[PDB]
Amino acid sequence: SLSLIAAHSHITGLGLDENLQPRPTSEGMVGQLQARRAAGVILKMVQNGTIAGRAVLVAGPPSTGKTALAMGVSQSLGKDVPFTAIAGSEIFSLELSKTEALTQAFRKSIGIKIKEETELIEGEVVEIQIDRSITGGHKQGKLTIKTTDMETIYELGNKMIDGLTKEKVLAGDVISIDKASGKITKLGRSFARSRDYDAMGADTRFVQCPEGELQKRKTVVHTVSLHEIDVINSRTQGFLALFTGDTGEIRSEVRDQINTKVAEWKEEGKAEIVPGVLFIDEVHMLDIECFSFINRALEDEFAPIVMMATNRGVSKTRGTNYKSPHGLPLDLLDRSIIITTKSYNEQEIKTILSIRAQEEEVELSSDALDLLTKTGVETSLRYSSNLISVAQQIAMKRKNNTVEVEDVKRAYLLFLDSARSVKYVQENESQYIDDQGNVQISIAK
Amino acid sequence: KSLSLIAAHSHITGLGLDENLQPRPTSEGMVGQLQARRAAGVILKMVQNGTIAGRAVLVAGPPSTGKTALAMGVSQSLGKDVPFTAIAGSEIFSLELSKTEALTQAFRKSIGIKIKEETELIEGEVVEIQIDRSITGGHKQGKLTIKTTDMETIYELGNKMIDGLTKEKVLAGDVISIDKASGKITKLGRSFARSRFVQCPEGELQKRKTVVHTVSLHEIDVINSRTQGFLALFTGDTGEIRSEVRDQINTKVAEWKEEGKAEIVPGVLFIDEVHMLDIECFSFINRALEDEFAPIVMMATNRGVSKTRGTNYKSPHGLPLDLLDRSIIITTKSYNEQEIKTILSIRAQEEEVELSSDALDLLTKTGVETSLRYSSNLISVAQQIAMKRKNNTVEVEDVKRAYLLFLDSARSVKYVQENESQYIDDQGNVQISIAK
Amino acid sequence: VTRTAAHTHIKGLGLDESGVAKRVEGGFVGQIEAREACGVIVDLIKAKKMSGRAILLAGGPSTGKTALALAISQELGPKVPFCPLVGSELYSVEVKKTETLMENFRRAIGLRIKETKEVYEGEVTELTPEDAENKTISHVIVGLKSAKGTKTLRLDPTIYESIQREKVSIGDVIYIEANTGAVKRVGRSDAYATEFDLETEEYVPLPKGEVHKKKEIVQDVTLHDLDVANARPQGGQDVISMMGQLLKPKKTEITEKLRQEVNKVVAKYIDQGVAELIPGVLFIDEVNMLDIEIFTYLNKALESNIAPVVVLASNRGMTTVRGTEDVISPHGVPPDLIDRLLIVRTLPYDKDEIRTIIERRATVERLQVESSALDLLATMGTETSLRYALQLLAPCGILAQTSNRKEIVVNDVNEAKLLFLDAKRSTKILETSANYL
Amino acid sequence: VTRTAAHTHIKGLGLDESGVAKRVEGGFVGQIEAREACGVIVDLIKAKKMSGRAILLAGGPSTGKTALALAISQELGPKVPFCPLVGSELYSVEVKKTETLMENFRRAIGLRIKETKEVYEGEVTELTPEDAENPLGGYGKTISHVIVGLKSAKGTKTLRLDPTIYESIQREKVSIGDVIYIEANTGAVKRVGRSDAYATEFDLETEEYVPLPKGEVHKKKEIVQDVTLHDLDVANARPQGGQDVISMMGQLLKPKKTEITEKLRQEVNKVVAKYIDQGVAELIPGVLFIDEVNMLDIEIFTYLNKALESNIAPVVVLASNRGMTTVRGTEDVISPHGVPPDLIDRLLIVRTLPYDKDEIRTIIERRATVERLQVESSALDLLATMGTETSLRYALQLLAPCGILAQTSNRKEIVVNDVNEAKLLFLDAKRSTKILETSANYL
Amino acid sequence: AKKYCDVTGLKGFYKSPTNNIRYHNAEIYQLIVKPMAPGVDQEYLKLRGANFVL
Ligand SMILES: Nc1ncnc2c1ncn2[C@@H]1O[C@H](COP(=O)(O)OP(=O)(O)O)[C@@H](O)[C@H]1O
Ligand SMILES: Nc1ncnc2c1ncn2[C@@H]1O[C@H](COP(=O)(O)OP(=O)(O)O)[C@@H](O)[C@H]1O
Ligand SMILES: Nc1ncnc2c1ncn2[C@@H]1O[C@H](COP(=O)(O)OP(=O)(O)O)[C@@H](O)[C@H]1O
Ligand SMILES: Nc1ncnc2c1ncn2[C@@H]1O[C@H](COP(=O)(O)OP(=O)(O)O)[C@@H](O)[C@H]1O
Question: Is Transcription there in the keyword field (chain B)?
């Protein structure tokens, strides 16, 4: 509901068959048959979950669909599987080192599934009668919990009374108590007992009285990443650092102890390891120290599958003074397999543009689609994809529903691409600030 | 008054200008620089009008020509309760603040909010205090007899008055002041009882007092930031105040001006050595001058076609051309013999240095051949040499002795270049041996 | 008397109902094509459908890129969020620059929440706490009274705790918010002002209006406000603390888990109809000051599902990108980001629209300029720069006012040109002189 | 007997009443014009009138610039605040370098204050609290007042303390029979210790035993205190000394330098000017000495240009061995002594000249007499030739190995063989460099 | 009860310690309360019902 239409919202996964053969147009993915087949092979390895630490480099020219292929892999991966999509610039931080940030990105992409059984008694409290013991030990209580339908009486122990007096629950408060584990919550105050007070308190919350059965059974599946366990065991109250982010370079011995405990919890069967994918978009923006740490960190058994994206040619590696293919050193490319994405022809440009126009609910005419395809082949895919929405707004300002040739031509005239802007800058270089800072603001001499 | 020894700009009491903004040749401690002083008077009238926001001016010229003197004259002619924030260019390179955040704090320290309020005060001379204790101490009663030069009254005190008078112990004969609503008692001091000493105050006790507060926008930003107390106004650990707090402060200040409960006092942000900022600070200044709640920024620099910090190219005044497009430049010129002589005479008159006419001529010749600051520094050491010989007047020989003992820049350069083997050069080579 | 900034005279884009830019309308003159492009952009923003759209305003200095950005801001209205920013502001010494960019991204997505404000104001007449133990009070009966009458309320022990926090006794005018539960003691009434001749009590009048007052308000928050509301290393934002806490809270890298939880809570409140989502504009002036790492994170963050419309400004040409060594790119923006941008070209001006800009700035600043003085100012603007005349307009008015004239004459313009220099004359003085000017 | 350092032999500038310099007095040899200029500067500091006066000591290595700064500090006396500093010390990882420079500027300005202290001192006889009637309200404390009885010599009185003062009492662990000392200015309590009126041989906590304090309880005593402006600034920036919880928790936090604002400094200046106007405090301006001023970069020099123009800035003296050198932090700014010409224009350069053979010889003689060594005349002449040939500092620092080799062979005198053996054992920089140039495996 | 000035009938901010008359401000105190003869305070207190002389 909150999500708007983004650049990759039309992709619902890799458009493959059961034989890992890509369809020409399926699930929002058009073309790139070799790349989609290779990504389908990658997805199966993640789904097998029996091998660890493979580095996959998605390489190609820009606007060819490396990030589109990564989002297709993430959508085909399904839910409750840890997919961590980060950029290469996020590793450089201020209170975390680059290796520690890479370790946190690695351990956020592999988790454990844990099954929980809850016997929840949810209802409004009618009366709490406390049997006051003479010695004070084993304080018996009588809880009158009540739903819309029906109401029982529960016996309450001393720690139950201490938990129900630690948080302030009174008559008319909606609480649910777990029978197996004794978990305590306070959902708030019932709406039936809401008008008795003229002004509500600071922490007073109003919730509806639950209906149906008083006690309900539910099975809850929790997917907890390894980084979550690291942050929890790093501090006394570590759950705040899961959200505020000031974890602060978790020491190694916590990580080895957590790895050994995850192994023994696996061997006794109360949790199961779910591996996932860590996707580093624009991986060329990383230091050589980051690349060396990636090279050593891919060899652990608790390591996810690493998909890296690069649009660089033979470029200078960051942190050094020599050039390298993909902006990556040769020992990183040694422990990697490369998926190459190619450019699109006119039919693939037209199909992707039609899919993006259908996603944004824009009614493109045939001549407007042909003009946008010609502009996409001439300039770029992303220029025509950005031109579609402003042409839609131009046509809507003209009191028209569908777009025509004139709306696309007006959007082409109003908004420039890279080559036209380069030509306009190079024709009048005195009006812009040079690399030496020189400029001519004066219009006459 | 406050703490003030004799400084470099102590003689400047403002801009020596007429009602038609015409500079007098010698007035208010400032001589020379007629066009620069008239331009500074125009900028002062822009500040005093208060209807023009975010104007950047650049005071540029040779060293020892009076750019900082012009800024001090503008600051002295501005008056009280108008915020003048003078900072150097190196002050915004902080370890706990970003440079744009430090520039934001310097910008918003120069815009004040003027609020007038009324308070009922009871300032009087205590005749006597009686308090009758109870059997146990549950209730305390008392009578406070106070007086002024005109009036004399007795008050039946409550419990909180008794507790606030026993704490901060008031005896008979004390002139005190009481704020009734806040319950604060300030002992102004002992009265004229022979048995500190302050006279008995005038009559009409419980008087309305109008207090006019000028609070800078940075202080309200620190206050409204709920994670920042006002102790960060003194400790300095404000720590990157968020932008949304500043937007709430701007909207509240605009609605206070619309409601008439407060006024806006624009001020001057002076940046000495503005070439020491880098290019990102120049871009931030270029955008931040467009705010409605932005002061008038005076910038001083002496560099000429220098390399801009953060870049690799050279720009005029060390400033990029988009910043110089947003600014009007005031140019200061050098001084002749007569202006140097008048400045040296003013500096001697300030430091209570009595010197002869030929000593003044010798100091003027030194300040023409060498520099104005070298002669102005030589004045005080020549005076010390004069009182070493038990002489109350600085003669020619005292100036000659001070010139012999203390060197200028050119003599130090020549004496270094004649004996360059004895010093450490760029390569770290030195011959500490004196023979062979 | 209102102050005047550099962009005060501009009130909007000056377009008609058909989107065609009127030549002189809305504080603008000329620049019709970029104004129409910005009108298409604000129509796209008002559609409230797209995310991550990016437009770059490219043109020379003093051509109106920031003018068009603030014109977009007035065309959208104060309801739509607008985050103006400099590329230099992203370099923070407390948190990393990509986190600052993502925080400014979340600052441009807002929420409207309709809410009620109900206030009980007046003097406490009765304060009777009913205990009904089961030590612990059951409730408290509080009788408030103003000049229009009295009213009795039943309050829970939390509000009784807040009342006893404020040292509220019988006879004190107090303030109670029914929804929040906040209790503020205004002070003692003047009916009890003569119990003692002198006491520390602050005696305030009885409220002239009713005890109970109810009204409707709207809360305009952002997603960054809700992000920093529940991401505090040291909590306690609810308690009113004039003095600071003992440990200074520092800006931290907010994880994506808090962003997803905040998004889930916001979507749950939107699906109930309580809150309304308003996408807004993040404007970055001088985008050439961004590091290449910030450009890479901008490339990653423009593909988010909740990203706002980003408007970038630059005045450079074929320039090396900051943080690189040999990447010559247009406007200082790398070509991977440029492929995601839509470029709006900003043209220079000629003499006539420079003259109308000068006369519009003179009319807004309430200065009377004679016609030949206006022609001299326009000629100086064509010769030196437009901003030189726009900044010399006010010294001309001051020099006219000191001569007891309300009309700016040609001699005032000559005197202001003599007193204040432009960049070219100061550069000539710099080049001719030898000893550092 | 006494431990000696490089500048132990110097007692002062050694000038006459007319300011002229005797050739060998005050531990100084030579540098007559430099000593006279330093005496003029010392008289300028003793005038206590000017602000921001800055001189530069310029010369080669081992010429006596730090010697002249120490002589200035010795001639001014211990009351005048002298702040020695290195240019490298301003680079701090906790706070910016300009704040460190301003902190040293405020540290070089001193204040002498007469302070009246209200004191309740005496032996605790009874200590009974009065409990609150509702202890668990959450708004007050468990007690309301505390009655404490104190007796001094010829006097006994009782005090009713509020719970804050009793909290300060009980944090000192005060019991019955303890002589204590309550300072009413801050609420601070000093526990002097057990009274000697009882038995003092049955304790296990190595406590001290004190008599009853003389005079009455509740005295008013006058203390002369010497502080600096930086002490007031750092006390107000990090508040400790009150009994409120902010002061007490700020006692326990880790101290860290902060950027003290101009508002706090102006408020401190206002309070100090009020102290002066009541005639209770006097201002003593002092000296900030910066040796190796070449280590400062261009930002510290730029801030120094502004900071020297203040009306409270001290007298700043600088030292540098550099000649025509580039300024640190710049690329092409060649400047004399590594100091930019904007600061040089605000300076007064005091030149320092190298020494001759006989001056080096008597400097070696004075360093031998201050280290309690006996040197023969021929060995002293060989030490003088070695000092003129290699370096003065090498000849001064070879005296202690000569004394070690002399006391090894059971002699008090230093013979020529001892200084020859010390020349053979220890090398100067030139002979070491000659070994470096004629070696293969990078000696 | 609200305290009033004994002669002018306005707000009585102050009470004179000698004759126990509550007055309004300085001018009434200097022109009426201070030059008040003995035997004139009794009527002013009697109008308020505080005539202590029986
Ligand atoms: N195979 C594809 N199917 C559908 N859309 C695609 C495909 N490849 C690219 N696109 C579209 O092109 C745009 C840019 O592609 P992108 O994933 O950014 O390529 P790269 O990551 O190589 O720059 C995306 O918004 C995406 O919608
Ligand atoms: N026109 C003037 N009138 C009086 N004093 C001046 C004037 N110009 C300069 N001075 C004095 O000369 C000294 C050095 O000038 P300064 O303000 O430092 O110039 P700059 O800042 O350009 O180096 C200052 O102490 C200043 O008071
Ligand atoms: N077309 C225009 N009509 C009216 N005023 C304009 C126009 N273009 C620019 N201005 C004015 O010129 C001033 C400087 O322009 P600005 O937008 O700052 O240039 P830049 O695009 O380099 O930021 C602004 O105050 C603006 O009000
Ligand atoms: N005029 C002098 N008389 C006596 N001793 C001196 C004299 N000048 C220098 N010295 C000695 O020479 C040594 C070097 O002096 P110092 O000032 O530390 O070096 P620099 O001059 O390089 O700063 C010091 O230990 C000092 O005792």
Answer: yes
